Symmetry: C5
Subunit: 345 residues, 5 copies
């Protein structure tokens, strides 16, 4: 038997009229290409750039009746990647590429197997820098959906139709983690069917779900800002007449609330709208600011001038024992309404 590298040059040569610029079943039914991807790497999810890079194996399967053979004995051939330009291949591309390239190290990472009845299996290795828009209106408590869609560039719906295969359309590698997200093990597979002023093009997409982990922002940002609000409240139990003690506890509590918020903006993303962590640090700044405005009333009622001196110091102690109950209670109402409206979403 003749070797398979020369049997393909007889099957696709100057004879038999095979042209790699003409789709199979030309002027007939469309070409049904079935696809599945295999994700090797995933991550570096940027929020300044709003993209994420991924490393996949793209497998494509179509039927080419011009490549059916019956003389050669073996059930499958394998075309070398140097001779790849002599095959009609689909013009799949990604609608949100934002940059992508092949892998060409030690061999072009390509693969092409032509079966006996003409089924063609074409697997390649691609690095993508896919773009997904992100909605950071509740930043530590958010789920980010990042799609991945696969259009056709030059053939319309009456010529070429993409499908996912019905047996494992998207697999993900096992030991694959992320620094700031987790990847849920459920994928949404649907169509999009892009229209233009050119024609109905085909496309298929796959959605992913990214639940952001929580435990860093509690230990570093929520719990330390929580304790500073508690330290604002020990002024109501410190003596009234200890005037350097109350205002030294006042501003130095709103200075460590300023340092806690300023030093943590370097770790946060730089979007220009208000988050959920931004309204925590703002309202917790308002409880520390309100503690010194309480003492500014106490240091003025009690200093105000026996009948009337007994009256005014009774009023400044009344405004103190009320606020021992009111400021933990009002802060507990905010601490309910905050976590309810951001866990329910």
């Amino acid at each position: 038997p003749m070797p398979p590298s020369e049997f393909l040059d007889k099957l696709m040569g100057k004879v038999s009229g095979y042209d790699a610029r003409i789709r199979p079943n030309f002027k007939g039914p469309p070409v049904n290409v079935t696809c599945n991807i295999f994700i090797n790497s995933f991550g570096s999810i940027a929020e300044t750039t709003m993209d994420y890079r991924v490393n996949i194996f793209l497998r494509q399967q179509w039927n080419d009746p011009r490549l059916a053979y019956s003389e050669y004995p073996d059930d499958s051939l394998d075309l070398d990647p140097s001779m790849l330009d002599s095959i009609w291949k689909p013009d799949l591309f990604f609608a949100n590429e934002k940059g992508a390239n092949f892998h060409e190290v030690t061999t072009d990472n390509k693969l092409l197997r032509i079966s006996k009845n003409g089924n063609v299996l074409y697997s390649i290795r691609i690095t993508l820098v896919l773009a997904c828009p992100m909605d950071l209106k509740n930043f530590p408590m958010d789920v980010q959906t990042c799609i991945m869609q696969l259009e056709s560039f030059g053939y319309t719906m009456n010529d070429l139709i993409f499908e996912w295969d019905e047996k494992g359309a998207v697999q993900v590698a096992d030991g694959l983690t992320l620094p700031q997200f987790i990847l849920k093990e459920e994928k949404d597979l649907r169509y999009c069917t892009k229209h233009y002023n050119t024609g109905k093009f085909t496309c298929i997409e796959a959605r992913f779900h990214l639940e952001r982990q929580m435990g860093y922002y509690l230990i570093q940002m929520y719990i330390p800002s929580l304790l500073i609000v508690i330290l604002s409240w020990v002024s109501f139990w410190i003596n009234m007449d200890a005037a350097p003690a109350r205002v030294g506890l006042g501003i130095t509590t709103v200075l460590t609330m300023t340092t806690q918020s300023s030093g943590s903006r370097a770790s946060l993303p730089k979007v220009s709208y208000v988050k959920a962590i931004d309204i925590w640090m703002a309202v917790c700044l308002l409880f520390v600011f309100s503690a010194l405005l309480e003492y500014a009333a106490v240091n003025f009622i009690a200093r105000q001038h026996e009948e009337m001196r007994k009256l005014f110091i009774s009023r400044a102690k009344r405004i103190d024992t009320v606020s021992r109950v009111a400021f933990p209670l009002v802060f507990l109402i905010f601490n309910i309404f905050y976590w309810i409206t951001y866990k329910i979403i």
Copy 2:
């Protein structure tokens, strides 16, 4: 009928004298090319680099009378992107590229349809790193216009003329957001007509409008610096003779004003001229600095030495009750004139 890949090699081959180095209507009227772009991605608007990257579909339409055909039955052909060098194409380029590339993943993302009367439709996919100059003299309250212009490189105005088409010249994709701006849904389409010492070249441009979002700088920078100025004012209601209380409230208020301004410069852009957020933090530093210079007068008039001791402590209380009205009032005048002169622009 002969297949379309060989009908184009008869239409553009060694016969018929078609040369891809000669424009249509040579030594005649100019070539009218009509263009429209479709923006897929948009963002990473840098201010250190003063650029922005964008991902478009560039569609071009011209008429080539050498490519009119009448033997072949179908109304449109489609040239394969490998055979692209056998077509006269316009030398469009972007006058502010600053770097750009094509997309070549799984197929060269190109498209070329030759109609029956010779109308040629040429769509490609380009990633641009277009450069727009930015004017940050009022940084949180600003509108940034970033143009996008499309010159001709080697053909002058008497040979090649660019136009926008009169049916949707610039579309933008739907789910397309930005981290720090919003994109207004109105586009300005005009000419520029570049002159050189070479000749009148043609160009068309498209302007975009970028209103910067506000809500981050209020919650993180304006409102916290606002409250620190309020805490400077509780010293006028704290007792005069409480000398460690007044000056402990003094410097620790101008220390949390220093920390608020120093820790927020990391989030701001690094231009070397004065912004509108820079004059907020500077004038708000002058109100906290002025509160301790008030007490430096009070701690000197009252300490100055019955007739004359009653006189001087009456003067130090007079300078205190005036400033209880004056410092909220002067700060309210600045709070009017600031927001009027930066919302009117």
Copy 3:
């Protein structure tokens, strides 16, 4: 004798039927390729990206019986790297490339020696950006394993089998250090044998071990946060009635604990889960926060109103001498359980 550049063009030319698209021993036993790498550079271990770049010499050895020669006298030939496409080479690739390239400066850095019995030695120089997942649950006290695996792309296990050689499979260059790790001088060499829906492909891997150095985080982060907890404890020896001294020592100790934690997050990695350095800074924040809640009880029991005044000031001194022993003792229990549970791992 004819020169070796023309003896290879006789050995691999149009005559003898040598085809570079057909593996040796075709339709026979598989091809046994034995491999060894030589690491020149190593480092830039990112944790945001979770990768590391490396610079190796990849040596491959296989036997090709089509390239055995006996007319030419010398024991070894050497094919020039321009004529490299006329040799069957294995399609080795790295399963976690994440980007890689060759070196082409002043010559393509390739090498190919064909021995007399057909043994082929193929050495190249590759820069890899290999991806390894990292587990930072105990950040200063951690060992990071980063693998390096070498699959086959198009030939299955019945056609091509990779091996390490039994004489020094992985060497590392001598003067090769890292900024944040040390590299242990022991390598684990094993198989992986990747399965797909395509076939059993071969792969070999090599594990490395990276013990993180310690001495920076002690001097910069553990010891300074240790001393701030000691300064919280000098309040129990300062007088009870010195009310501005106790609370000035209180908040300014929890302000320098806030500054110590905020200013050190810029040096730490930005994962979104809790580390071991994150629970040090959190629990050490709880001991400084607890010191002022101690004095809030002392300043309330002693102020509470001879028989009963002698009773209450005796109780506030009792709660002070207990806490002189209890807070160094409770902190020593945490200081045991922390370092035991993170040195035992």
Copy 4:
């Protein structure tokens, strides 16, 4: 008349002996090439890297007597950029490239016009990453000169001579700004004439001048550090015996001077030598440090022990009223000598 694309293939074909590897006027006088650049973009002036990127149109004009024609009627031809290798072009390069590339988007951005007497006009579009050394010994008050030189690589001075043209040798685009500099509208045009151990090569250069803007460093760094030195001086007017007031005003003024200097190093460049802004923040730290050493003398003379108690408290008030004049006066002498020695440069 024959079309111009075939008239050039007759003018430069196998006939007439035109060789693109031989300069015009070979073994005769040198080739006089006249050059002018047109700057489109300018900026991203790095100081860590010490470079700046620029985007120019490089126009070159020389005379080639082999390309003179008289049969064809029109005064100018235009060679297509695909056929560019059939023309002798000068080997101009930039002596401080540090990286550069062409622009190849939608057409190679090249241009070549051969006049009737043989004058050749060759315009291209280049992105350069030119390197200029910077001298930051007085950082906010500095002028940076960044040159741009254009050598010849393989032809010496007796073969090829570069010139600027005498009609606008360097133009700059109109709406072109910088984030941290301004560009003066005067250019210095001179020669350099590089010598080596190879031969006298030609080169021309063009200098630019970059005056750094001022207004950011005044508002953010000079004026806030100025006001902290003023707050050190209100201790001399606060009472002597107010011991917690004086030292609370002392260290908290040198703490807000520490925060002002530490938080502003992130915005400054990271050179490893002393600037002019570095000696401002250092000497202004010495005036705040000297204010507390003044009170350390006052709190020791007055505490030192009627005749002798009247003597020592008279001496501690004498050392206070002297320093009310001396510290504004000594700081004003530094405030003169500083701004004189950095505006005169």
Copy 5:
């Protein structure tokens, strides 16, 4: 005389049997190549990456007896860089490339002159990203040696031998500075002679010396941390009984020592071991921490309870006048031993 571009095609054509895949003096003595580099640019010395980029002219000189000519009159020819593949060139490469590329802007920056007796001069322009390991155990006081070695890839020592020339082997351009180092004007030139399991390959290297500048770390980090230790010592001269004055001077001195160390870690490199600047900031933290532990003893001995009250206050004044001498003296001993052990290295 025939033109030189055709005389080289006669000297290296199909006739005369010249093969560019065979070294000169084949099966004879080795090839003596003499080399010298000319450094144009130098810098961006990274410490996270541990590399540095450089821009050189690499000149190589060897003798090829196949290229000797005597018919043509002129003493030197010059081969055009398009025809470069018809010359045996040495396979020099850099053993620590870590990435490198050529320069191809406006012409390939190459040069090749064949003398009359066959001496070949080959100069090219290369941008290298050479890797040098750095030892930051004493960070502001260190000398960094970064080598640059030039191996041979495919020819062993019995075939090809590199040498430096004996007339200026390494020159450096004149106006060439660095942001954080200075470059000493002395170069070490030596051999390395790499051995492998392949053969004895040749290599030559050149060492450079980089003394780090000092003046930034004194003004920004050493002197400000020096003055904070002095402010710890003014508590021994402030009154004993001024209890809010002593502890307000205590923690606020160790807070400005925390801010001085935290805010300066952003400018320092991120190695994970202890530097010399790291032990300065740590020991200077121990002197400020020790000043408050001194007063914690004074505030307990003097408060401890006429005979015995006179005894204990005499002991608390004794422990104060000792420490007025001891803490400047112990700090001066550390200030000797530190600068001796880091200037002697």
